[PDB]
Amino acid sequence: EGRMQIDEQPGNAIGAAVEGFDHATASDADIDALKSTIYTKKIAVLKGQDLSPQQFLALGKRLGRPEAYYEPMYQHPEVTEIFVSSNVPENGKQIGVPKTGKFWHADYQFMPDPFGITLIYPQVIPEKNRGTYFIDMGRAYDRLPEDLKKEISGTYCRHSVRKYFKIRPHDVYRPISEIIEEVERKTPAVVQPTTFTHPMTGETVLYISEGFTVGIEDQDGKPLDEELLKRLFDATGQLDESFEHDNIHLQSFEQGDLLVWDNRSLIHRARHTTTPEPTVSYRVTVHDERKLHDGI
């Protein structure tokens, strides 16, 4: 219908708030405007969302084609397409996986065909130590020194989940070498251009993350020294354990908020566990009408 209102942050400031959005009744033009906001303001916060797990998936389906997480221990017991980050037991049982994403990453960056849009529906929000950190890697690329842009021009990076693969209940008593090899078979390292062109905005995106990017190689596929990756992590703010770097944005939320963000441009990371406050979050990840980049 006609009372969804989008309030974009002024200028080049990241973020936008969306009032009066109803996924069941929003028009085609509403969805078109919401997606444009996601690609340009990078983070759209839908306000006043009171959804069941099934309704959350229905909302995600308005934006794109959902993909379920490839490791099923993360999946919601009713809705396979919902990724559950939770350290609150439900009737004594562990739902989803606790303490996820404690590292800089873009979602499915270790996979050959990553999705363009991530949706997060916080269920239990810490009172004090709430929020998620973000870095716009297109803005971060633009702010690099010109020579550093030159150095990565024409290079490729390898992305792998081999550092942050989480042990599963059925992995107990297995030799660790056998899990390490299984991960390399199941999810081999993915080669991508170090930078790619955003299909929706045309921006140049620096598609690296401290958590998943394990190597960089030249225009001929010969590995380059990892010091280059360290200098790129350092320049974009990914090594600042104080989180005060100018590139870093802390996105807070309140009950009823639903975060929808550009999974091409942004990397993100959970806060330090400086308090014992718990986190429960539902995630839906959808493919939109373009691949992550033209080379996929």
Ligand X SMILES: C[C@H](CC(=O)O)NCC(=O)O
Which residues fall in the annotated binding site for Fe(2+)? 105, 107, 268
CB of 80 to ligand X, least distance (A): 15
Strands of the 190-193 sheet, one edge to the other:
190-193, 156-159, 213-217
Number of residues that make up the chain: 296
List the one residue from 97, 248, 258, 259 that touches ligand X (CB under 6 A): 97
164-193 binders of ligand X (CB under 6 A): 164, 166
Element (DSSP H or E) covering residue 83? strand 83-86
Residue 271 binding result from ligand X, Cl ion, none, given CB thresholds of 5 to 8 Å by partner type = Cl ion
CA neighbours closer than 13 Å in the CB half-sphere of residue 47? 10
100-119 binders of ligand X (CB under 6 A): 100-101, 105, 107-108
CB of 161 to ligand X, least distance (A): 6
Query: DSSP letters of 185-228?
Result: HHS--EEEESEEE-TTT--EEE---TTTEEEEE-TTSPBPPTHH
Q: Are 9 and 41 in contact (CB under 8 A)?
A: yes
CB of 263 to ligand X, least distance (A): 9
* Residue 47 or 130 having the CB closest to Cl ion: 130
Tell me the two tokens of residue 136.
Answer: 């716009």
Binding-site entries: 69, 74, 101, 105, 107-108, 166, 268, 272, 283
Q: Are 39 and 32 in contact (CB under 8 A)?
A: no
Residue 101 binding result from Cl ion, ligand X, none, given CB thresholds of 5 to 8 Å by partner type = ligand X
CB of 163 to Cl ion, least distance (A): 11
Draw the binding track, 143-162, toward Cl ion (x: CB under 5 A; -: no contact).
---------------x----
Angle at 119 between CA 116 and CA 123, to 5 degrees: 165
Query: Which residues lie closer than 8 Å to 168 by C-beta, 6 or more apart?
Result: 71, 73
Draw the binding track, 236-255, toward Cl ion (x: CB under 5 A; -: no contact).
--------------------
266 is an interface residue for ligand X by CB under 6 A: no
Enumerate binding residues for Cl ion (CB under 5 A).
158, 189, 271-272
Enumerate binding residues for ligand X (CB under 6 A).
97, 100-101, 105, 107-108, 161, 164, 166
